[PDB]
Design an enzyme around this catalytic site. Structure first.
Site, PDB file in Angstrom:
ATOM      1  N   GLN A  63      11.708   0.945  16.351  1.00 62.98           N
ATOM      2  CA  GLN A  63      10.449   0.297  16.757  1.00 62.98           C
ATOM      3  C   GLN A  63      10.457   0.426  18.342  1.00 62.98           C
ATOM      4  OE1 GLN A  63       7.580  -0.813  15.063  1.00 62.98           O
ATOM      5  NE2 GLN A  63       8.466   0.783  13.976  1.00 62.98           N
ATOM      6  N   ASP A 121      -6.098   1.996  15.257  1.00 61.40           N
ATOM      7  CA  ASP A 121      -5.456   2.373  14.150  1.00 61.40           C
ATOM      8  C   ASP A 121      -3.893   1.780  14.329  1.00 61.40           C
ATOM      9  OD1 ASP A 121      -4.981   3.725  11.833  1.00 61.40           O
ATOM     10  OD2 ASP A 121      -4.013   5.548  12.630  1.00 61.40           O
ATOM     11  N   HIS A 123     -11.473   5.642   7.835  1.00 65.33           N
ATOM     12  CA  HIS A 123     -10.947   6.460   8.621  1.00 65.33           C
ATOM     13  C   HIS A 123      -9.533   6.779   7.516  1.00 65.33           C
ATOM     14  CE1 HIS A 123      -7.924   3.093   9.172  1.00 65.33           C
ATOM     15  NE2 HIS A 123      -7.026   4.089   9.770  1.00 65.33           N
ATOM     16  N   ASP A 124      -9.057   6.160   6.464  1.00 65.84           N
ATOM     17  CA  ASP A 124      -7.973   6.451   5.667  1.00 65.84           C
ATOM     18  C   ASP A 124      -8.243   6.485   4.216  1.00 65.84           C
ATOM     19  OD1 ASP A 124      -5.600   7.163   7.235  1.00 65.84           O
ATOM     20  OD2 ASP A 124      -5.338   4.974   7.662  1.00 65.84           O
ATOM     21  N   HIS A 168      -1.332   1.965   3.983  1.00 66.69           N
ATOM     22  CA  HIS A 168      -2.595   2.543   4.062  1.00 66.69           C
ATOM     23  C   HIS A 168      -3.807   2.296   3.017  1.00 66.69           C
ATOM     24  CE1 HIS A 168       0.001   5.131   6.593  1.00 66.69           C
ATOM     25  NE2 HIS A 168      -1.083   5.085   7.335  1.00 66.69           N
ATOM     26  N   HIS A 228      -5.555  -2.374   5.509  1.00 67.39           N
ATOM     27  CA  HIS A 228      -5.501  -1.705   6.946  1.00 67.39           C
ATOM     28  C   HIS A 228      -7.011  -1.016   7.258  1.00 67.39           C
ATOM     29  CE1 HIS A 228      -4.035   1.283   9.756  1.00 67.39           C
ATOM     30  NE2 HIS A 228      -4.679   2.302   9.165  1.00 67.39           N
TER      31      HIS A 228
HETATM   32  C1  LIG Z   1       0.366   5.668  13.050  1.00 68.48           C
HETATM   33  N1  LIG Z   1       1.641   4.792  12.498  1.00 68.48           N
HETATM   34  C2  LIG Z   1       1.471   3.390  12.532  1.00 68.48           C
HETATM   35  C3  LIG Z   1       2.700   3.083  12.658  1.00 68.48           C
HETATM   36  C4  LIG Z   1       3.133   1.426  12.517  1.00 68.48           C
HETATM   37  C5  LIG Z   1       4.116   1.028  13.253  1.00 68.48           C
HETATM   38  C6  LIG Z   1       4.504  -0.263  13.325  1.00 68.48           C
HETATM   39  N2  LIG Z   1       3.758  -1.193  12.448  1.00 68.48           N
HETATM   40  C7  LIG Z   1       2.668  -0.705  11.671  1.00 68.48           C
HETATM   41  C8  LIG Z   1       2.239   0.595  11.759  1.00 68.48           C
HETATM   42  C9  LIG Z   1       3.666   4.050  12.839  1.00 68.48           C
HETATM   43  C10 LIG Z   1       4.995   3.952  13.046  1.00 68.48           C
HETATM   44  C11 LIG Z   1       5.726   4.783  14.208  1.00 68.48           C
HETATM   45  C12 LIG Z   1       7.123   4.695  14.004  1.00 68.48           C
HETATM   46  C13 LIG Z   1       7.957   4.059  13.001  1.00 68.48           C
HETATM   47  O1  LIG Z   1       9.070   3.970  13.053  1.00 68.48           O
HETATM   48  C14 LIG Z   1       9.822   4.686  14.298  1.00 68.48           C
HETATM   49  C15 LIG Z   1      11.333   4.984  14.206  1.00 68.48           C
HETATM   50  C16 LIG Z   1      11.833   6.003  14.578  1.00 68.48           C
HETATM   51  C17 LIG Z   1      13.271   6.315  14.339  1.00 68.48           C
HETATM   52  C18 LIG Z   1      13.802   5.453  13.270  1.00 68.48           C
HETATM   53  C19 LIG Z   1      15.298   5.730  12.877  1.00 68.48           C
HETATM   54  C20 LIG Z   1      15.687   4.779  12.044  1.00 68.48           C
HETATM   55  C21 LIG Z   1      14.999   3.864  11.535  1.00 68.48           C
HETATM   56  C22 LIG Z   1      13.681   3.597  11.979  1.00 68.48           C
HETATM   57  C23 LIG Z   1      13.070   4.625  12.886  1.00 68.48           C
HETATM   58  N3  LIG Z   1      11.747   4.132  13.157  1.00 68.48           N
HETATM   59  C24 LIG Z   1       7.160   3.116  12.113  1.00 68.48           C
HETATM   60  C25 LIG Z   1       5.924   3.095  12.158  1.00 68.48           C
HETATM   61  N4  LIG Z   1       2.731   5.260  12.778  1.00 68.48           N
HETATM   62 MG   LIG Z   2      -4.430   7.993   9.001  1.00 68.44          MG
HETATM   63 ZN   LIG Z   3      -4.904   4.306   9.542  1.00 64.73          ZN
END
Ligand SMILES: Cn1cc(-c2ccncc2)c(-c2ccc(OCc3ccc4ccccc4n3)cc2)n1
Ligand SMILES: [Mg+2]
Ligand SMILES: [Zn+2]
Length: 314
Positions: free
Chosen positions: A270, A218, A107-108, A69, A73
Site C-alpha cells: 500500500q 477511481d 466506468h466499470d 468492481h 464502486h
Molecule cells: C486502480 N486501483 C485501485 C486500487 C485500490 C487500492 C486501495 N484501495 C482500493 C483500491 C489499486 C491497488 C494498487 C495496488 C495494490 O497493492 C499494491 C501492492 C504492491 C505490492 C504488494 C506486494 C505484496 C502484497 C501486497 C502488495 N500490494 C492494491 C490496490 N488499483
Molecule cells: Mg476499471
Molecule cells: Zn473503477
C-alpha cells in the site's frame, strides 16, 4: 417531474457535499443518492426522471457481484466526481457535467474481477477484440448498449452534435480509468503546469485534466476515513488474490500483489502505491484544481495510517 426535488436525511444531505462521504451499506438508497447528485450538479432539467431511473436500474443490473468492481464502486466513483464538480462550479461545460457523472456510474460496467493482464494471458475473446485498455473499451461498449435500449436514451434532447460530443467525453473518460495510461497522462500534466503551457481552452488539455479527475475518482477509496480505506483494501485484495489463484492455474506465478501467500506484505505494498500513484495523482490534481485539496490531505492521512500499521502501532 419537475417540482419533484429528491432529498436525503440531514446527515446525508450535509456529508454528501464532502469528498470523504461513504455512501453506506443500504444498496436501495444508492440510486436516490446518484439522482440527488445529478439534480444538484447538472439540474432537475438535464434528464427525464423516468428515463434516468430506467438507465440507473439497467446500469446496476450490468455490474456483477464481485468483491470490489461492483455497483457500490460505481456509485462511490460518481460521488467523488460530484464533489469535484461542486467545488469547481464554473470550470465545466453543461455537456461535461452531464457526461462525467454518467461516465463514472458506467466506468466499470460488466467488470469480472480480473485485470486486463489476466484477460490477455487467459486469451479471453475481449482481448482479441480490444488489444489495449481491454476491459475499458468493453465498459464503454456496455454504456452505449444500455443507452440504446428502448426508453434509456437520457441524452434524447441533445442535438446530433452535442450527443456525439457527450459520448466522446464519456468514451475518453472511461478509457482514462485504465491506470496503465495514468502515468504518462499525469507526467504531461505536471510538465504543462510547471512550464505554464496548461490551457483549459485547449480541448486536448481539457481531455487530459478530465483523465486525471477520472483517475482521482477511481482511486478515491484511498481518500476516505481510515476505517473505510482499511475495509475497502480487503475487497480489492479479495479480487487480486482470486486472480492470483487463476494465474497459478494457467501455470504462472502471479506478481506478489496478487499472491495470497504474500498477504503479510500488504502494508508495504500500500505504501508503494500511495508513493507511486495516489499521492502524485491528488498532488497534480490539487495544482490544477486547488479546491480538490481535501482529497490530497485525506490520502496523506491514510499513507500515515499504513506507516503506523508497519511500525506495529496498529
Ligand atoms: C486502480 N486501483 C485501485 C486500487 C485500490 C487500492 C486501495 N484501495 C482500493 C483500491 C489499486 C491497488 C494498487 C495496488 C495494490 O497493492 C499494491 C501492492 C504492491 C505490492 C504488494 C506486494 C505484496 C502484497 C501486497 C502488495 N500490494 C492494491 C490496490 N488499483
Ligand atoms: Mg476499471
Ligand atoms: Zn473503477
Amino acid at each position: 417531474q419537475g417540482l419533484m426535488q429528491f432529498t436525503l436525511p440531514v446527515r446525508l444531505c450535509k456529508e454528501i457535499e464532502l469528498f470523504h462521504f461513504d455512501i453506506g451499506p443500504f444498496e436501495n438508497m444508492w440510486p436516490g443518492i446518484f439522482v440527488y447528485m445529478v439534480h444538484r450538479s447538472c439540474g432537475t432539467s438535464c434528464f427525464e426522471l423516468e428515463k434516468l431511473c430506467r438507465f440507473i436500474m439497467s446500469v446496476k443490473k450490468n455490474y456483477r457481484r464481485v468483491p470490489y468492481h461492483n455497483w457500490k464502486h460505481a456509485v462511490t466513483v460518481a460521488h467523488c466526481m460530484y464533489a469535484i464538480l461542486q467545488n469547481n462550479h464554473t470550470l465545466f461545460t453543461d455537456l461535461e457535467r452531464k457526461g462525467l457523472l454518467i461516465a463514472c456510474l458506467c466506468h466499470d460496467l460488466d467488470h469480472r474481477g480480473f485485470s486486463n493482464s489476466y484477460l490477455q494471458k487467459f486469451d479471453h475473446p475481449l482481448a482479441a477484440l480490444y488489444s489495449t485498455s481491454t476491459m475499458e473499451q468493453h465498459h464503454f461498449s456496455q454504456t452505449v448498449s444500455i443507452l440504446q435500449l428502448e426508453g434509456h436514451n437520457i441524452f434524447s434532447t441533445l442535438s446530433s452534435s452535442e450527443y456525439e460530443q457527450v459520448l466522446e467525453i464519456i468514451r475518453k473518460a472511461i478509457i482514462a480509468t485504465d491506470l496503465a495510461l495514468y502515468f504518462g497522462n499525469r507526467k504531461q500534466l505536471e510538465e504543462m503546469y510547471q512550464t505554464g503551457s496548461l490551457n483549459l481552452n485547449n480541448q486536448s488539455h481539457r481531455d487530459r485534466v478530465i483523465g486525471l479527475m477520472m483517475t482521482a475518482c477511481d482511486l478515491c477509496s484511498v481518500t476516505k476515513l481510515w476505517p473505510v480505506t482499511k475495509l475497502t483494501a480487503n475487497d480489492i485484495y479479495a479480487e487480486f488474490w482470486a486472480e492470483g489463484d487463476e494465474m497459478k492455474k494457467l501455470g504462472i506465478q502471479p506478481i506478489p500483489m496478487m499472491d495470497r501467500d504474500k498477504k503479510d506484505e500488504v502494508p508495504q505494498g500500500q505504501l508503494g502505491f500511495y508513493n507511486a500513484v495516489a499521492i502524485p495523482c491528488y498532488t497534480t490534481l490539487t495544482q490544477i484544481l486547488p479546491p480538490t485539496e481535501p482529497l490530497l490531505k485525506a490520502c496523506r492521512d491514510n499513507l500515515s495510517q499504513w506507516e503506523k500499521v508497519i511500525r506495529g502501532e496498529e
